[PDB]
Amino acid sequence: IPKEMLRAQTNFILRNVLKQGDNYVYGIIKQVKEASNGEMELNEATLYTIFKRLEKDGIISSYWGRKYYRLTEIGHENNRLAFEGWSRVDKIIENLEANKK
Amino acid sequence: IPKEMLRAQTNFILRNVLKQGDNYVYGIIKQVKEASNGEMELNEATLYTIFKRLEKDGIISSYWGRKYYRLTEIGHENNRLAFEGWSRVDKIIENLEANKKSEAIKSRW
């Protein structure tokens, strides 16, 4: 149940949200609550902190509309490599199980 | 380049590797290199850090022949909970895309 694994799962979900296009912090929370049948309510302050860190890192930018955030060009590449990485993970997991079988 | 996400991907692989049975560090590198057609070589240091954390927390124990690692009873439970969590993530993402595709069809019309 380690906190580094819960955080990786939460990062993966945020990555998929920002993949869709521009969003704002309360809209993200709304979307994840509905898509998780209520299981998962992201804390708004935590979300701002993560985003401030991503913004400082050039991964994310923002503009006023409500503040909206969107992936930068560096952010979109970081995301593509992250999803490509998970696809290879998925494929490696299949071959390891076929190899055992 | 997502560095914390690389570590989660390496952790995810290792969990499934240990699920298949006991192993040693370099045998794991071999098996995953074979299972990826040579594309992917796990960094040995990332591997050790994970195993040093898993060993300290009782998820894995080890034995000498070369050091081998095995999932403990606690490890199998931790593992099952990790896969439940990753499975719920997969469904949340599907629900996020079905909901966005729904909003978009209703917005064309």
With a CB cutoff of 8 Å and minimum separation 6, the contacts of A87 are none
Contact B85, A9 (CB under 8 A): yes
- Dihedral sign, Cα of residue A23, residue A74, residue A4, residue B18: positive
Whether residue B60 lies within 8 A of chain A, CB to CB, comes out as: no
| Helix ranges (DSSP H) in A1-101 | 3-20, 25-35, 44-56, 73-100
Give the orientation angle of helix B3-20 with respect to helix A73-100, to 10 degrees.
10
Token code pair at residue B21: 């049975």
* Number of domains making up chain B: 1
With a CB-CB cutoff of 8 Å, which residues 24-43 of chain A face chain B?
31-32, 34-37, 39-40
With a CB cutoff of 8 Å and minimum separation 6, the contacts of B38 are none
| The 3-state secondary structure of chain B, one letter per residue | CCHHHHHHHHHHHHHHHHHHCCECHHHHHHHHHHHCCCCCCCCHHHHHHHHHHHHHCCCEEEEECCEEEEECHHHHHHHHHHHHHHHHHHHHHHHHHHHHHHHHHHHHC
Give the closest-approach CA distance of A5 to chain B in angstroms: 7
Terminal Cα distance for chain A, rounded: 29
Task: For residue A39, list chain B residues with Cβ-Cβ distance below 8 A.
Answer: 88, 92
CB spacing of A11 vs B17 below 8 angstroms = no
Experimentally determined by: X-ray
CATH number at residue A59: 1.10.10.10
CB spacing of B11 vs A31 below 8 angstroms = no
- Phi, psi (degrees; rounded to nearest 5) at A24: -130, 165
Q: What is the chain A residue with the closest CA to B41?
A: A92
Terminal Cα distance for chain B, rounded: 39
Q: How far apart are CA A96 and CA B31, in angstroms?
A: 7
Whether residue B58 lies within 8 A of chain A, CB to CB, comes out as: no
Contact B11, B53 (CB under 8 A): no
| Coil, helix or strand at residue A71 | strand
- Phi, psi (degrees; rounded to nearest 5) at A46: -55, -45
Q: How far apart are CA B7 and CA A39, in angstroms?
A: 25
Contact B47, B29 (CB under 8 A): yes
Domain that holds residue A67: 3-100
For residue A1, give the DSSP letter: -
With a CB cutoff of 8 Å and minimum separation 6, the contacts of B31 are A96, A99, B17, B23
Of B7, B32, B100, the CB nearest to A92: B32
* Annotated resolution, angstroms: 2.5
Residue matched to tokens 């997991």: A93
Q: What is the chain A residue with the closest CA to B8?
A: A8
Contact A40, A72 (CB under 8 A): no
Whether residue B8 lies within 8 A of chain A, CB to CB, comes out as: yes
| Coil, helix or strand at residue A23 | strand
